[PDB]
């Protein structure tokens, strides 16, 4: 936004991907915002948990979620209408969902 660009030391570096919720709606889907003095690193169908929340902690409570990028510090994410309401508190990280080689043989089959 300005040309400033802070002088601190470095912090950010490896290891998963975070962010802060600095406000977030009720809705079915639900439009939510990141922190000032945080990035988002998620596309639409990434997925992301809550950490600590106030009021709608159930999010939390009930494994990660798909999320919807509306923006740069925009986006939304599934049907948050089944919890309570947002009060405070709420960390979007970047859960580790599978991603492996995954796969399933119920029948028989050795030699064709």
């Given at each position: 936004?300005?040309?400033e660009?802070?002088?601190?030391?470095?912090?950010?570096?490896?290891?998963?991907?975070?962010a802060?919720?600095?406000?977030?709606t009720?809705?079915n889907?639900?439009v939510v915002?990141?922190?000032?003095?945080?990035?988002?690193?998620?596309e639409t169908?990434?997925?992301?948990?809550?950490?600590?929340?106030?009021?709608?902690?159930?999010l939390?409570?009930?494994?990660?979620?798909?999320?919807?990028?509306l923006?740069?510090?925009?986006?939304?994410?599934?049907?948050?209408?089944?919890?309570s309401?947002?009060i405070r508190?709420g960390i979007?990280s970047?859960?580790?969902?599978?991603?492996?080689?995954?796969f399933?043989?119920?029948?028989?089959?050795?030699?064709?």
């Amino acid at each position: 936004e300005f040309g400033e660009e802070m002088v601190l030391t470095d912090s950010n570096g490896e290891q998963p991907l975070s962010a802060m919720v600095s406000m977030v709606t009720k809705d079915n889907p639900g439009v939510v915002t990141c922190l000032d003095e945080a990035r988002h690193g998620f596309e639409t169908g990434d997925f992301v948990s809550f950490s600590e929340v106030q009021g709608m902690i159930q999010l939390n409570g009930c494994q990660p979620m798909e999320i919807k990028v509306l923006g740069p510090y925009t986006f939304s994410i599934c049907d948050t209408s089944n919890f309570s309401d947002y009060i405070r508190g709420g960390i979007v990280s970047q859960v580790k969902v599978p991603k492996k080689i995954s796969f399933k043989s119920l029948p028989a089959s050795l030699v064709e």
